[PDB]
Amino acid sequence: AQNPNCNIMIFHPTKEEFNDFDKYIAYMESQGAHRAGLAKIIPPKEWKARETYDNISEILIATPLQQVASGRAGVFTQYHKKKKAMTVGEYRHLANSKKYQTPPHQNFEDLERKYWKNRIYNSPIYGADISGSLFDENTKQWNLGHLGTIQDLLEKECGVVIEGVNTPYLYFGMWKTTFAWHTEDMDLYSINYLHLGEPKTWYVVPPEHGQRLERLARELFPGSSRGCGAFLRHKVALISPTVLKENGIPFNRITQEAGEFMVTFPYGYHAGFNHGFNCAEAINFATPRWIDYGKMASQCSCGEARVTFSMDAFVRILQPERYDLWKRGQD
Ligand SMILES: O=C(O)CNC(=O)C(=O)O
Ligand SMILES: [Mg+2]
Ligand code: NI
Numbered sequence: 001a002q003n004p005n006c007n008i009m010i011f012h013p014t015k016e017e018f019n020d021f022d023k024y025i026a027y028m029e030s031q032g033a034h035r036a037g038l039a040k041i042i043p044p045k046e047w048k049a050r051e052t053y054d055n056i057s058e059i060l061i062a063t064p065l066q067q068v069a070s071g072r073a074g075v076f077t078q079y080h081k082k083k084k085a086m087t088v089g090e091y092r093h094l095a096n097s098k099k100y101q102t103p104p105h106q107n108f109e110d111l112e113r114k115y116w117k118n119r120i121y122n123s124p125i126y127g128a129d130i131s132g133s134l135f136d137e138n139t140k141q142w143n144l145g146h147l148g149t150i151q152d153l154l155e156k157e158c159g160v161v162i163e164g165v166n167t168p169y170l171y172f173g174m175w176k177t178t179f180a181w182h183t184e185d186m187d188l189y190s191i192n193y194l195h196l197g198e199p200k201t202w203y204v205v206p207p208e209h210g211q212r213l214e215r216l217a218r219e220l221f222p223g224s225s226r227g228c229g230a231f232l233r234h235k236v237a238l239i240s241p242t243v244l245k246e247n248g249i250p251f252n253r254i255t256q257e258a259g260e261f262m263v264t265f266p267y268g269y270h271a272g273f274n275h276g277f278n279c280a281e282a283i284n285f286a287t288p289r290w291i292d293y294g295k296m297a298s299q300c301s302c303g304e305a306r307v308t309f310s311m312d313a314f315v316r317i318l319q320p321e322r323y324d325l326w327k328r329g330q331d
């Protein structure tokens with residue numbers, strides 16, 4: 001069995017190997033990369049996402065989100081307070097202001113310490129989930145707006161033809177902006193490219209041990225657990241590495257830098273934070289190996305998780321017994 005310790009693997013494809021996306025995902029899985037829940041892919045030196053970023057300040061962040069925490073430093077939830085619209089140029093200046101900027105630090109480890117000590121005491125503002133792309137249309141390799149669609153994958157594997165679309169999303173971050181512990185919708189893969197700026201630190205639980213994280217989360221967030229049998233779908237709960245280690249939860253960590261891709265694998269729980277002003281692009285995707293994970297994915301029916309249009313068909317086809325209850329939670 002490849003990668004039996006479930007370590008995060010780092011890949012360096014050549015320009016030739018970067019042509020065929022599906023083939024390279026399958027290669028990484030042949031080497032056991034999925035067992036970690038997360039992999040890093042460093043593009044060949046010949047590749048570029050686009051020519052320059054010199055012209056992005058006019059993108060609008062229609063609904064910036066202030067991430068307000070409650071709890072203790074290592075075990076907290078966050079809620080998103082909506083803020084007035086602002087441009088990427090305005091948001092960058094805000095991220096760099098004395099109130100929000102990255103503090104002085106020695107290295108990524110010191111910064112990680114400072115994040116887990118102090119996160120709860122601040123409310124950083126995140127531009128998340130913005131439909132769009134920063135890949136040049138002429139970038140042919142690993143262009144996250146040109147991937148094979150999940151609808152097409154389901155049609156190819158299972159024969160069924162469904163409505164829905166699959167487009168990328170932009171994320172503009174600042175120091176302490178936080179992504180809560182989650183798996184993807186329908187336990188899909190994700191791919192995330194850090195276009196520019198400061199790093200992103202990731203934490204991940206191997207898929208084979210995801211239920212260990214769920215059981216700890218039920219213990220740590222007991223009211224939330226009574227409210228919903230899949231409350232991690234709400235994407236609000238944070239648990240620190242120290243707390244994970246105290247409770248014996250297997251996990252790994254890695255820091256993504258500008259120019260790098262990360263892939264999350266089906267049912268790989270992940271969480272993390274941004275180091276400073278940055279911009280990422282991410283999209284969900286599927287492969288044949290996903291289908292069994294999609295059939296078994298948990299679902300939130302309490303009403304909180306509210307998701308895209310395209311998840312309807314995935315539930316309806318892969319999980320027809322759950323469909324009626326889940327759709328009630330959507331409506
Ligand atoms: O970058 C972020 O804020 C969160 N991204 C992801 O959870 C992802 O790419 O799957
Ligand atoms: Mg612009
Ligand atoms: Ni994710």
Ligand SMILES: [Zn+2]
Pocket residue numbers: 227228229230231233234300301302303304305
């Ligand atoms: Zn719920």
